[PDB]
Design a protein around this ligand. Structure first.
Ligand SMILES: [Xe]
Ligand SMILES: [Xe]
Lengths: 201, 191
């Protein structure tokens, strides 16, 4: 039951470790998207550079390069708003639970100390009733302090653990939903450029 | 003159072409980086997917297909866009050398004429030199006068074909990826 609680603690550290990695990979994916965007803009700038203003389709190829720019921007901004910054509430939960767990640990040590002291007094050599009285009071106090920390963690850790499912499912549904749409809209731009370039064949 | 405007066009064609090669190479590197980051994200889903959630196997097949798609996309860009960019650019160095060399063979001939002119005011020999210098210059001149316009013309076809090839292979990549993301959204909706 130390054991029951230590399992919650081990689940909590795993949940914390996995949720940290998922964001970092999200962050890295985000930075990829931005660099793919910048590279695509330079590549389109090469086409614009050679495409003369009077050649048929020039203005339209331009329109398409600007739509491409906008599409990458919107994908990246939506990923940020809908998948990355939507994690805030959930991860925000962790720091203070971690802290409360280490504090529960110290209050348990304090409680164990006060038990040990109370115990040393019960095996005199005539009992010193007054010292017993104070040690008993310190024991009961340190037990209450420990037991409050303990009771709130015991309901809170299973609740958090269970919510990890929702978090993962929702984050990946937002990313996959956004991604389906981006790639759909993309392909249309590729098609539009292709039809313009058919004119110069 | 005419030949100097041809040389100018050529310098420009080489500059644009080199910039396109540099930018394509970057684009291919970015496509690889976006593949790898996407793959890692997928791996985070795979590592958290519980055995008692339905669709675990289907999610692994989707991720495997996703990896293969990205790999196919990058490889078609190499084959259809980049290695063709390289062949077109491979003709430029020798022509560039031949422009510089023609320039020198022109001064060579001018100074052989300015010398047959100078003596005539030993002459048996200078006229020999002038004929050799004329035959060597004019042989470079004619070859470049054909070749520079014909290279210049081919620029449009090379750009059109490069950018059409990209837009076709990208259309297919994006259409196919869109379907794979839809397949993953359907699995996830069922949790
Ligand atoms: Xe073009
Ligand atoms: Xe998930």
């Amino acid at each position: 039951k130390d054991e029951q609680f230590e399992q919650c603690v081990q689940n909590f550290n795993k949940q914390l470790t996995e949720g940290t990695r998922l964001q970092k990979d999200l962050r890295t994916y985000l930075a990829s998207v931005k660099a793919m965007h910048e590279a695509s803009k330079k590549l389109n700038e090469c086409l614009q550079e050679v495409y003369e203003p009077d050649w048929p389709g020039r203005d339209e190829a331009n329109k398409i390069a600007e739509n491409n720019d906008l599409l990458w921007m919107d994908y990246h901004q939506k990923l940020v708003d809908q998948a990355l910054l939507t994690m805030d509430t959930y991860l925000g939960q962790f720091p203070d639970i971690k802290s409360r767990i280490a504090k529960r640990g110290r209050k348990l040590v304090d409680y164990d100390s006060a038990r040990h002291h109370y115990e040393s007094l019960q095996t005199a050599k005539k009992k010193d009733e007054a010292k017993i009285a104070k040690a008993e009071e310190e024991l009961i106090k340190a037990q209450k302090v420990f037991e409050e920390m303990n009771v709130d963690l015991q309901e809170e850790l299973p609740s958090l653990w269970n919510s990890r499912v929702g978090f993962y499912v929702n984050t990946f549904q937002s990313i996959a939903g956004l991604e389906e749409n981006f790639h759909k809209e993309m392909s249309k731009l590729n098609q539009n450029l292709n039809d313009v370039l058919v004119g110069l064949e």
